[PDB]
């Protein structure tokens, strides 16, 4: 299943030529986490660093839990949408965009596309195509 977690990430960041593709897992503690992990070279891997353990909030598990896609073109325009908690993040590790569509069976986890060179209008068929590869890892989990 690991495996089949790092091929996925690999696989989508190829298909979007996004900077990053990783998978976020929210933990039975309420905690949530990074768990797979494809990068370009230019940036930092995540999984590598030692963050100290991050709440995944219950107003967002019961948002994440209905499956719909957020597309994130600009997080820092002040009506993209970006949780007010992850502004000095996107600062820190220079995200400009970001695509997330949650793993549901119940939230599982987040696959979750980083623009790091530019902000990034993400159109409407790839909305549809991060569904159709969420749909893809909740049916390798069952
Ligand atoms: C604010 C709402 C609360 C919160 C929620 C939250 N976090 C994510 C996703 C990620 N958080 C990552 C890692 C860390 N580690 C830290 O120490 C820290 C604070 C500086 C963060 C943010 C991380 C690698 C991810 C996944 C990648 C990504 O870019 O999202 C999410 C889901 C994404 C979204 O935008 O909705 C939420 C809701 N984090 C907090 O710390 C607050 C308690």
Same mark, same amino acid.
Do not use: N
């Given at each position: 299943?690991? &495996?089949?977690?790092? +091929? +996925?990430?690999?696989? !989508?960041?190829? =298909?979007?030529?996004?900077?990053?593709? %990783?998978?976020? $897992?929210?933990?039975?503690?309420? +905690?949530?986490? +990074?768990?797979? &992990?494809?990068?370009?070279?230019? /940036?930092?891997?995540?999984?590598?660093? @030692? #963050?100290?353990? @991050?709440?995944?909030?219950? @107003?967002?598990?019961?948002? /994440?839990?209905?499956?719909?896609?957020?597309?994130?073109?600009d !997080? $820092?325009?002040?009506?993209?949408? %970006?949780? &007010?908690?992850? !502004?000095? #993040?996107?600062?820190?590790? $220079?995200?400009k965009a970001?695509? =997330? !569509?949650? =793993?549901?069976?119940?939230?599982?986890?987040?696959?979750?596309? $980083?623009?790091?060179?530019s902000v990034?209008?993400?159109?409407? #068929? @790839?909305?549809?195509?991060?569904?159709?590869?969420?749909?893809? =890892?909740?049916?390798?989990?069952?």
């Amino acid at each position: 299943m690991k &495996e089949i977690l790092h +091929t +996925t990430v690999t696989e !989508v960041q190829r =298909i979007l030529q996004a900077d990053r593709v %990783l998978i976020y $897992h929210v933990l039975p503690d309420g +905690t949530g986490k +990074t768990i797979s &992990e494809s990068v370009l070279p230019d /940036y930092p891997t995540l999984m590598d660093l @030692e #963050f100290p353990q @991050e709440v995944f909030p219950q @107003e967002y598990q019961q948002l /994440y839990a209905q499956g719909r896609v957020r597309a994130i073109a600009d !997080v $820092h325009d002040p009506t993209a949408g %970006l949780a &007010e908690c992850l !502004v000095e #993040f996107v600062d820190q590790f $220079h995200i400009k965009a970001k695509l =997330i !569509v949650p =793993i549901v069976q119940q939230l599982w986890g987040l696959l979750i596309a $980083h623009q790091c060179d530019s902000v990034r209008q993400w159109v409407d #068929f @790839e909305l549809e195509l991060m569904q159709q590869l969420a749909d893809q =890892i909740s049916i390798a989990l069952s």
